[PDB]
């Protein structure tokens, strides 16, 4: 499948994208990173990671009420793009209500802990955040605690060679609804490790998903899943102008 306006229909920033002028007038700690371009427009220098951090932290504060602390030394996520994936998963696990508790896994949560944070806020989803990087693990366990989401999000430091399988030994939950992953920059080799772990977990997770960075990666993975005889295999492409990612998910369910 593929979504109109190249991004998910339920995305906040599809109809109402970020307004630099507005955010500068509200958050004077963001006003410092914004500069007036030639066209008179209020613009952020996307090269400066401190500027980009200021935007991402402000959009979380402004639109989700999330106050996060993230280091420059680590990846700065781009709020609207990550949000498409949150909505795609919503669609996959057939969102719809108050007594229907849905639980997922985030393979590589990052310093931000962006997916579990959005996910637990927007929908109240229980998450199992995994991390190999200590710095990332420290900041994520911190952002979760400071937004009092300690109850829904369970951040866990994990060994290097370990993925999905190994992580589901603490805690012991029978059925997980989804698992999202944003592979770090071979890419194909990573999702292949996810595919394999999914072959042994099968119906224990309703949906296994992966946000890809390269379109070339879709063709072999689509073929791998097909060779392994995976019943449902779904894919889409998201967008944020210059940026473009390819989310792919697969289920063993009829
Ligand atoms: N085998 C593995 N298991 C768990 N986490 C891993 C891992 N390999 C890498 N990671 C971690 O996963 C992260 C990938 S970056 C994805 C971060 C986040 N979801 C975002 O979009 O902001 C890194 O912080 C890295 O330390």
Residue numbers in the entry: 1 to 96, 99 to 187, 223 to 291
Manuscript text:
METTL16 is the second m6A methyltransferase identified, and its known substrates include U6 snRNA and the human MAT2A mRNA that encodes for S-adenosylmethionine (SAM) synthetase (Pendleton et al., 2017). Consistent with the SAM-dependent methyltransferase activity of METTL16, both structures reveal a Rossmann fold composed of a central seven-stranded β sheet (strands β3–β9) flanked by three α helices each (helices α4–α6 and α7–α9). In contrast, we show here that METTL16 is active as a monomer, and it contains a large deep-cut groove that can accommodate structured RNAs.
Two constructs (core, 1–291 aa; and ΔN, 40–291 aa) encompassing the methyltransferase domain (MTase) were expressed in E. coli and crystallized (Star Methods). First, and most striking, is the presence of an N-terminal module (1–78 aa) in the core structure that is appended to the α4 of the Rossmann fold and that consists of three helices (α1–α3) and two short β strands (β1 and β2). Taken together, our two structures reveal an architecture where the MTase domain is attached to a METTL16-specific N-terminal module that is essential for activity. Indeed, when mapped onto the METTL16-core structure, these reveal a positively charged cluster (K5, R10, R12, K14, K16, and R41) that forms the entrance of a wide deep-cut groove. With additional contributions from the N-terminal module (K47 and R74) and those from within the Rossmann fold (R82, R279, and R282), the groove runs all the way to the catalytic pocket containing the bound SAH. The residues K47 and R279 serve to constrict the space within this groove, while R74 overlooks the ridge that surrounds the SAH-binding pocket. While 20 residues between Q191 and T212 are not visible in the ΔN structure, a much larger region (35 residues) between F187 and G223 lacks density in the core structure. The full-length METTL16 and the core domain versions were able to methylate this RNA (RNA6) at a specific adenosine residue (A17) within the nonamer UACAGAGAA motif.
